Design a protein around this nucleic acid. Structure first.
Length: 60
DNA sequence: AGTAATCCCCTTGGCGGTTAAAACGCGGGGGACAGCGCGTACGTGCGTTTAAGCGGTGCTAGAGCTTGCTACGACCAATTGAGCGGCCTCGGCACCGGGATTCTCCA
């Protein structure tokens, strides 16, 4: 309706996170998921995608 | 306010391989070590003299202690920017290869 396309946060208990990852992919096939969990080194590699410079995200 | 589950993180342990470093064998060389001769250089004893050590006298510098206060640092609250943690990148240093120069050793 408004092309906001994020950033959206989703904060869950740890047993549930793969359920979100999968059900999000099911309930929208074309909508893009960042799975921010793992060891500190793994999170550092994931954090590269947190763009601060746009407060509203493009579909790209 | 307590005690236990949950979850991060970071250390220890194991498995595989690969290859670079440790172990093993062997000839020979030359350095360790015992042996010899000499000779000069250090320990000994004596006579010499030199001044260190002691008992004693004299002075004043300055170590040590008290008094008095005010200049300087301890303490607190409000302000802010210098310095730290996190992210980025590109250029310095390593690593390789190949031909050029050096050094070593037997002739």
């Amino acid at each position: 309706r408004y092309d906001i396309w994020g950033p959206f946060l989703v904060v869950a208990p740890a047993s549930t996170l793969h359920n979100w990852q999968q059900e999000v992919s099911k309930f929208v096939p074309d909508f893009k998921v960042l799975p921010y969990w793992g060891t500190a080194a793994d999170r550092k590699v994931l954090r590269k995608f947190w763009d601060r410079k746009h407060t509203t995200y493009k579909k790209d």
